[PDB]
C-alpha cells in the first residue's frame, strides 16, 4: 500500500520504465510472430508478401 509510495521508489520506477516498455514491446512482437496476427502483419512491407 504505502510501502511503495516514495521518491526513491518513484525514481526506481522511472529508471525501469524504458526496460519494462522494451520488454512489453518484445512480448508484443513475439505474440504477433507466434500467432501470425493479420491486423498488425498487413502493414510491414516484406511480410505482407506471404499473406497475399
Amino acid at each position: 500500500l504505502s510501502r511503495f509510495l516514495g521518491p526513491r521508489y518513484r525514481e526506481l520506477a522511472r529508471n525501469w520504465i524504458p526496460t519494462a516498455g522494451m520488454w512489453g514491446t518484445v512480448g508484443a512482437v513475439g505474440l504477433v510472430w507466434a500467432t501470425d496476427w493479420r491486423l498488425i502483419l498487413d502493414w510491414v512491407p516484406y511480410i505482407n508478401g506471404k499473406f497475399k
Binding site: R8, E11, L12, N15, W16, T19, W23
Partner: protein
C-alpha cells in the same frame, strides 16, 4: 565556515622545475614537523623480467650504506636527529621519504640526495640483503591478501610488464648481481622522473635552494640515448585458482579493468566503491549498515570481511572487490556482490549517490589529513598527473557526480565485462568463469 570555503582556505602547493627537469613541490602548513620525500617513476612496469627484483632490492640497499656515509652512518645520523626513514615500492612509483622536524630540513634533503644519487652497493651487503629478501618473500607468502593481489595482477595483465610483482621471483633474486642493479639505477633514476615533495612546516624557497644545492645534476643523460617508453598493457579477462584446503579461510578477488589515472571517471568509480563499501567482522554496525552487501553478509553470516578497491596505473588499473569468507559461502558472496554491482549499474538512486559522495569526501579529506599522507599525495600527484589536484577541484568533481552519470560509468566499466578472478584457499564454492560472467550480466538489464 562551509565546506567550499574551508577547502579553498586549504593552502595551495608550490611546484618548480630545476634546470635538469627534476620537479620540486612543497606545501607549507602550521605544523612543527614535516615530511620530505623523493618520488621516482620506476618500478615493476619498467622492469623487464631479467631485472624484476631490482627496484625492491635497491629499496633494501638504499639505507644500508652510501658513498659519503659508509655502512650505518646514515642510520646513525637519522636516529640522532630523531627522524623516521621510510620507503615503499609499487608497480609505478618508488618513494623514499623522511619524517622529521622543521629545523632539520637541510639535513633531511642532504640525506635524501645521498640516498638517491649516491647509492653504494657492497657485494657482502648484497648477499645479506639477498638472504633478508628471501626470508621476506617467505613471510609474505605466509600472508594471504598479498598472494591474492599478486595473483590478480598476474592473471589480469599476463604477458605484460604489469603482471610481475614488486619483489620478483626467487630465481631473479638469486641471480641479481651488482652490475644489473647499477644498470637499473642509471636507467631509471633520471631527473625528469623524480619529484622532491616536502609537506608540513617547510619553506618553498629554502627547499628550492636545498634542491639546487644537493639534487642538482643527478644524471641528466641516459648514456645511450635510449629513453624507455611505457607501452599500454593488455587486460586479460581470466581466472587463477590456488586450491589448498588446509587454509582455514578463502580469499577471492574479482576485478575488472580500471579507468586509469587521467580518466575523469575515477571519481565516479570511487563513489560507486564507497556505495558498495567495505566490512570486517569487528564492525559494530550489525544489520543496520547502509551498505546492502555488508548488511546481507552480517545477516546471513556469509563472509569474515570484504572490501572494494580501485587501483590505478598509467591508462589502466584494477577495479573490484576482495573478500575473505569460509569455504561454504563463496558462491553466496559472489552472487550478492555481483547483484550489488548490477544494482549500481542499472538502478542506482540519488540517496545512495549522496551517501557515497559524502563518504568519498570524508575519506578523501581524512586521507589528506597529516603531513606524511599529504607529502605522499603531492609526490604521487606530480608523478602521475603533472600537477597536484586541489581539494576544491576534487569537491567540484564530486558535486558534478550524480545518479545518471554514475549509472552510465558503472555500466561502462562493469556491465557484461570479462573479469579477472583470483582465488586462494578452499575455493570449491567459487563458481566457474562462465557462472561469474553470467553473474556479471543480467537477463532483465
Amino acid at each position: 565556515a562551509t565546506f567550499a570555503q574551508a577547502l579553498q582556505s586549504v593552502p595551495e602547493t608550490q611546484v618548480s622545475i630545476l634546470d635538469n627537469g627534476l620537479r620540486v613541490a612543497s606545501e607549507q602548513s602550521s605544523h612543527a614537523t614535516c615530511t620530505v620525500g623523493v618520488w621516482i617513476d620506476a618500478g615493476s612496469r619498467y622492469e623487464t623480467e631479467k631485472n624484476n627484483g631490482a627496484g625492491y632490492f635497491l629499496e633494501h640497499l638504499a639505507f644500508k650504506g652510501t658513498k659519503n656515509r659508509p655502512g650505518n652512518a646514515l642510520e646513525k645520523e637519522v636516529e640522532s636527529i630523531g627522524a623516521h626513514l621510510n620507503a615503499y615500492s609499487t608497480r609505478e612509483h618508488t618513494a623514499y621519504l623522511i619524517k622529521a622536524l622543521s629545523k632539520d630540513l637541510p639535513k633531511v634533503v642532504e640525506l635524501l640526495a645521498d640516498i638517491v644519487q649516491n647509492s653504494s652497493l657492497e657485494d657482502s651487503q648484497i648477499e645479506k640483503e639477498r638472504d633478508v629478501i628471501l626470508r621476506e618473500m617467505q613471510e609474505n607468502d605466509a600472508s594471504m591478501q598479498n598472494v591474492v593481489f599478486d595473483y590478480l595482477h598476474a592473471t589480469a595483465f599476463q604477458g605484460t610488464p604489469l603482471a610481475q610483482a614488486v619483489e620478483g621471483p626467487s630465481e631473479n633474486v638469486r641471480r641479481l648481481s651488482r652490475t644489473d642493479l647499477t644498470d637499473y639505477l642509471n636507467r631509471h633514476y633520471k631527473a625528469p622522473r623524480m619529484v622532491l615533495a616536502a609537506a608540513g612546516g617547510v619553506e618553498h624557497q629554502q627547499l628550492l635552494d636545498l634542491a639546487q644545492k644537493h639534487l642538482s645534476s643527478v644524471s641528466r643523460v641516459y648514456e645511450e640515448d635510449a629513453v624507455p617508453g611505457l607501452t599500454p598493457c593488455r587486460f586479460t579477462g581470466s581466472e587463477i585458482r590456488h586450491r589448498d584446503d588446509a587454509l582455514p579461510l578463502a580469499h577471492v578477488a574479482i576485478a575488472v579493468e580500471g579507468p586509469g589515472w587521467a580518466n575523469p571517471d575515477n571519481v565516479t568509480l570511487q563513489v560507486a566503491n564507497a556505495i558498495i563499501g567495505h566490512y570486517d567482522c569487528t564492525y559494530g554496525g550489525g544489520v543496520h549498515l547502509s551498505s546492502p552487501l555488508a548488511s546481507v553478509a552480517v545477516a546471513n553470516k556469509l563472509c569474515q570481511s570484504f572490501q572494494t578497491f580501485n587501483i590505478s596505473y598509467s591508462d589502466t588499473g584494477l577495479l573490484g572487490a576482495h573478500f575473505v569468507c569460509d569455504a561454504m559461502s563463496i558462491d553466496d558472496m559472489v552472487f550478492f556482490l555481483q547483484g550489488q554491482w548490477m544494482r549500481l549499474c542499472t538502478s542506482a538512486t540519488e540517496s545512495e549517490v549522496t551517501r557515497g559522495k559524502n563518504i568519498l569526501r570524508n575519506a578523501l579529506v581524512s586521507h589528506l589529513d597529516g603531513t606524511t599522507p599529504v607529502c605522499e599525495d603531492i609526490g604521487r600527484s606530480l608523478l602521475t598527473y603533472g600537477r597536484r589536484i586541489p581539494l576544491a577541484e576534487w569537491e567540484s568533481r564530486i558535486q558534478e557526480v550524480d545518479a545518471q552519470m554514475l549509472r552510465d560509468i558503472c555500466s561502462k566499466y562493469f556491465y557484461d565485462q570479462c573479469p579477472a578472478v583470483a582465488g586462494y584457499g578452499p575455493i570449491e564454492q567459487l563458481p566457474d568463469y562462465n557462472r561469474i560472467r553470467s553473474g556479471m550480466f543480467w537477463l532483465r538489464f
